Structures are given as structure tokens and as C-alpha cells.
Design a protein around this ligand. Structure first.
Ligand SMILES: CCCCCCCCCCCCCCCC(=O)O
Ligand SMILES: *[C@H]1O[C@H](CO)[C@@H](O)[C@H](O)[C@@H]1O
Length: 151
């Protein structure tokens, strides 16, 4: 159902922007890291939910493919902003001693995001599939950048 996927993608967007707020307020305190991690785990769950919902949906109509494609691609700048915000806080991450947690989260989120993109590509129109794939290459490149910073 396209509406469920759109709802799922909106929730993902909200999760990401909440996570960015946590990053921007992070001063290297472990309780802050824990609070942020709770949001990150909600985000993982919400991405996986979207993947499950996409896998349960049949080939999208033209308008539904456009809606889902634009909703997925609309995530891109918020993702980049979020990754930039945690990258900006590397000194505080290292001070807190939680670099491996950030790295583990980045790897899990990239894998889950890639699975979601694959599931949406499979039900999109042929043209939208190419658009989603190109956008996903950019998302993957941003993940790879953040991962490099933290390893
Ligand atoms: C489509 C998903 C996009 C996600 C982009 C943001 C990825 C952030 C991953 C790092 C999470 C780290 C959370 C706990 C550690 C901390 O905040 O101090
Ligand atoms: C690679 O991309 C990440 C995510 O946007 C940046 O934070 C990093 O500085 C580098 O440009």
C-alpha cells in the first residue's frame, strides 16, 4: 500500500531530524549518548518497518511510484545533515569513548537503508527505479564518508 509506505517514510524523516537535534546538543556526556542511541534504535526499527511494508506492496501505480520516489529522495538532505552533525561531534564522541557505537550504528543504518531502497526500487516504475538508485548511490557515499571519519 503506497499510503503506508509514505507514512513509514515520514516517520523515518522525523526520526532522522530528532537524531540530528541530539547530535547538535551532544557535549560528550554518556547519558546524552544513551538518549541519542534510543532514537537511533527507533530509526533502525522504522527503516525495517518500511522495508517490510514495501515488500508487502504490489507494483506501484505511476502516481504512487512518484510519491514514494519523492518521499525517499526527500530524505537525502536530512540524511546528509544528520551525518554531518555527528561527524562535527567526533571530538565529543572520542571524549565520551563511544566511537565504536557510532560506527556500529552507521554500518547497521547503511545496510538497512540499502535494503529499503532495494525494496522500493523493486515496486517502482522503471524510470523511478533509476532515480531511486542514483539517489541511493549518493546516500551510500555519505554513509561511507561518515564511516571513514569514525574508523
Ligand atoms: C536513512 C537513515 C539516515 C541516518 C543518518 C544518521 C546516522 C547517524 C548514525 C550515528 C548514530 C549514533 C547514535 C549514538 C551515539 C551518539 O549520538 O553519541
Ligand atoms: C563525507 O560526507 C559526510 C556526510 O555528508 C561528511 O560529514 C564528511 O565531512 C565528508 O564530506
Amino acid at each position: 500500500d503506497a499510503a503506508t509506505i509514505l507514512s513509514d517514510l515520514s516517520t523515518i524523516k522525523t526520526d532522522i531530524n530528532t537524531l540530528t537535534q541530539h547530535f547538535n546538543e551532544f557535549t560528550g556526556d554518556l547519558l546524552q549518548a544513551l538518549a541519542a542511541q534510543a532514537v537511533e534504535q527507533q530509526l533502525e526499527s522504522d527503516i525495517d518497518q518500511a522495508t517490510a511494508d514495501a515488500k508487502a506492496t504490489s507494483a506501484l501505480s505511476a502516481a504512487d511510484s512518484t510519491s514514494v520516489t519523492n518521499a525517499l529522495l526527500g530524505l537525502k538532505p536530512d540524511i546528509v545533515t544528520s551525518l554531518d552533525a555527528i561527524v562535527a561531534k567526533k571530538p565529543q564522541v572520542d571524549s565520551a569513548g563511544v566511537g565504536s557505537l557510532v560506527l556500529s550504528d552507521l554500518n547497521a543504518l547503511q545496510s538497512k537503508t540499502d535494503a529499503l531502497s532495494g525494496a522500493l526500487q523493486d515496486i517502482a516504475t522503471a524510470t523511478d527505479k533509476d532515480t531511486i538508485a542514483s539517489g541511493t548511490q549518493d546516500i551510500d557515499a555519505a554513509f561511507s564518508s561518515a564511516i571513514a571519519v569514525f574508523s
